[PDB]
Amino acid sequence: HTYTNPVLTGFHPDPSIIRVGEDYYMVNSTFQYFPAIVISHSKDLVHWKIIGHGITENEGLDLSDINDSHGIWAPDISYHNGTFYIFATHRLNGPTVINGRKLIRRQIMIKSSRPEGPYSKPVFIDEGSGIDPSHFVDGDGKHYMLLSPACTLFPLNEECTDISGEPVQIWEGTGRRAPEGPHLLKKDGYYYAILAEGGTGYSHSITTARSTHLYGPYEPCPYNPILTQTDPDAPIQRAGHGKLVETQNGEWWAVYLCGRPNQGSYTTVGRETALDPVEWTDDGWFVINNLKGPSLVQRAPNLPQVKWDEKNFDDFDEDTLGLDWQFVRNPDHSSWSLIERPGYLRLWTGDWDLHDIRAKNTVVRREKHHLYSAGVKLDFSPSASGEQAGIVCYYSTNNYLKCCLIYEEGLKIKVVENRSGCQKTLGKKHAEAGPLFLKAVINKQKRDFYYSYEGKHWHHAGGTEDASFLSDEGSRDAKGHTGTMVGIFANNGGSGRKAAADFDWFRYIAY
């Protein structure tokens, strides 16, 4: 067959991939979202499903105070001698001292005998000089950590628990700001160093070097940049941060991150993971997509195609929270449940609105399309001012768009946008009592909400004609590194009473 990029749509930055046997595994940055480090599985490199996460509170890292687009980012997954290694960076809210150590970020090492975990408790490697750690072992079994700026090589104990001395930069890069995303690869004696250069913005690219020996000297590639988007009209932009993988059939493919401009320079869905083949030259270099840049349509890998259960309808009947959901920061396990009313996902109304960092139990899944629908059946009965629950299209504390059943001098269905820190009520209609149907209709940059009492007749509650603020660039946040999510929420305002909001099902329709 053929496939269309990106293969893993939705909020999926900083891809990293390994092949073990017939299986392929991917990790993506998650920032303030919990659980941390989303782990995905594929058999054909085209169709991916989420299979778990790296840090799941059993190994207790806490994000309840982490700022937007801070926290766990840029993971690398690797496999050596029956152990899966995930190295990642925890970006701090700001300068923080840990052992006479002015640090703004820390490296994390978790490991497990299985790709989906449970991984070990995060071991910190407090080397705050760079970002995008990647794991590399050499033919002699010595473990190394690559960090930015460019390729700085860190030896590791066996162990991978701490640096065993001497940092050294094996490749400086070409030029261009933010030489990062370092990756090494040993192929036929040579050591291939991979970089991301130009910044994660629209000048993003992939540049590589090569050396006979691990510690250099490395010569630049004559095809640099081996991957970039030079066509500003192409629907896929900001291509970079790649990693190579070789299939069981001898093919070579590269996953990388990319953005889909949504009617302008707005990556509403966030950075996604794209796919493209790797072709080897006769002078010992590799190139992505024959230097043609990101492909829109592409010959699919020579692997048996395996498509997954999308799980776009969640009836909340299984005892386990489905792996496509994410919590904004750590859950409040006292105020959410799938067991207090089986068949329903119960959210007790928290004490904080979505614009606060302390809001809890916002449950959201990724938007994978610019044209989609999101629906919910809700059993909710707000009794006092401020008590509310419903659907939200969420980017960050300063940028969301919510629709909720609320008590505000009687039952009301209310549409509220938070646009770059500015709250505005887009609509408010009288609400009758009883189970309620809410539908979020997303049409490119136009997004509206509809309420219903039987799922058959819909009424417009309110909407916006400009949802550009639900994007990386439109959010105007100091760091727009995530992506817009759609999901459910509940808070009291307001009146610190625990009112139960029972969501019978969630429904996602790409139309």
Q: Which residues are annotated as a binding site for Ca(2+)?
A: 315, 343, 504
- Our CB check for a copy of itself shows the closer of 214 and 510 to be 510
Quote the longest CA-to-CA distance of the chain.
75
Answer for which of 5, 207, 208, 237 binds a copy of itself (CB under 8 A) is 5
From the list a copy of itself, Ca ion, none, partner contacted by residue 371 (C-beta under 5 to 8 A by kind): a copy of itself
Per-residue burial over 353-390, b = 16 or more CB atoms within 10 Å of its CB, e = otherwise: bbbebebbbbbbbbbbebebbbbbbbbbbbeeebbbbb
With binding defined as CB under 8 A, does residue 441 bind a copy of itself?
yes
Which entry of 116, 180, 448, 502 is annotated as an active-site residue? 180
Residues 153/120, Cβ–Cβ less than 8 Å: no
457 binds a copy of itself (CB under 8 A): yes
Q: Which stretch binds a copy of itself (CB under 8 A): 17-25, 138-146, 332-340, 364-372?
A: 364-372
Q: Residue 29 contacts by C-beta under 8 Å, 6 or more apart in sequence?
A: 13, 14, 37, 72, 73, 74, 75, 88, 481
CA 94/CA 92 separation, integer angstroms: 5
Instruction: Quote the least distance from Cβ 397 to a copy of itself, whole Å.
Output: 29
14 catalytic per annotation: yes
> Residue 345 Cβ, how far from Ca ion at the closest point, in Å?
8
Of the ranges 88-96, 321-329, 451-459, 497-505, which one interacts with a copy of itself (CB under 8 A)?
Answer: 451-459
User: Which chain residues interact with Ca ion by CB under 5 A?
Assistant: 315-316, 343, 504
Q: Closest distance between a copy of itself and the C-beta of residue 374, in Å?
A: 9
Question: Annotated catalytic, 409?
Answer: no
- Residue from 12, 346, 360, 439 in contact with a copy of itself (CB under 8 A): 439
Closest distance between Ca ion and the C-beta of residue 316, in Å?
A: 5
What tokens were used for 451? 């309420």
Within 40-99, which residues bind a copy of itself (CB under 8 A)? none
Dihedral, CA of residue 407, residue 411, residue 415 and residue 419, to nearest 10: -10
What token pair was written down for 463?
A: 């909407």
* Chain residue at closest Cβ approach to Ca ion: 343
Residue 433 binds a copy of itself (CB under 8 A): no
Please give the structure tokens belonging to residue 299: 């010959």
Smallest separation, CB 407 to a copy of itself (Å): 23
Q: What are the start-end ranges of the H helices in 391-433?
A: none
Strands (E), 293-398: 297-299, 313-314, 326-328, 336-337, 345-348, 363-366, 371-379, 388-396
Q: Measured from the CB atom, is 263 or 302 closer to a copy of itself?
A: 263
Specify whether the CB–CB gap between 145 and 125 falls below 8 A. Answer: yes
Cα 289 to Cα 297: distance, rounded to the nearest angstrom: 11
Stretch that binds a copy of itself, among 34-42, 72-80, 386-394, 444-452 (CB under 8 A): 444-452
What tokens does 374 get? 């999101």
Residue 505 lies near a copy of itself (rule: CB under 8 A): no
How far is it, in rounded angstroms, from Cα 481 to Cα 476? 11
# residues near a copy of itself by CB under 8 A: 27
Which residues have C-beta within 8 Å of that of residue 185, sequence separation ≥ 6?
191, 192, 193, 194, 244
**373, 381, 385, 495: which one contacts a copy of itself (CB under 8 A)?**
373
Based on CB atoms, which residue is closest to a copy of itself, 150 or 426? 426
What Cα–Cα distance (Å) separates residue 330 from each residue in 139, 203, 210, 211? Answer: 40, 34, 43, 44
Contact between 190 and 212 under an 8 Å Cβ cutoff? The reply is yes
Q: Which helix (H) or strand (E) holds 144?
A: strand 143-147
Distances (CA, A) of 166 to 146, 154, 415: 12, 7, 57
Q: Which one of Ca ion, a copy of itself, none is in contact with 4 (Cβ closer than 5 to 8 A by kind)?
A: a copy of itself
Which 196-235 residues touch a copy of itself, going by CB under 8 A? 235
What are the DSSP E strand ranges found in 226-305?
Answer: 227-228, 237-246, 252-259, 272-280, 286-288, 297-299
Subset of 295-354 contacting a copy of itself (CB under 8 A): 296-297
Among 164, 247, 443, 495, binds a copy of itself (CB under 8 A): 443
Query: What letter does residue 291 receive in the DSSP assignment?
Result: G
282 binds, among a copy of itself, Ca ion, none (CB under 5 to 8 A by kind): none
Q: How far is the CB of 471 from a copy of itself (least distance, A)?
A: 16
**Is the separation of the CB atoms in 81 and 143 below 8 Å?**
no
The stretch among 83-91, 112-120, 188-196, 448-456 that binds a copy of itself (CB under 8 A) is 448-456
Identify residues 267-306 at the interface with a copy of itself (CB under 8 A). 296-297
- Nearer to a copy of itself by Cβ, of 192 and 372: the residue is 372
Minimum gap (Å) between residue 510 Cβ and a copy of itself: 8
133 or 294: whose CB is closer to a copy of itself? 294
At closest approach, how far in Å is the CB of 210 from Ca ion?
47
Name which position in 43, 260, 271, 419 contacts a copy of itself (CB under 8 A).
Answer: 260
Binding site for a copy of itself (CB under 8 A): 4-5, 235-236, 260, 263, 296-297, 370-373, 439, 441, 443-444, 448, 450, 453-458, 460, 509, 511
Catalytic residues: 14, 180
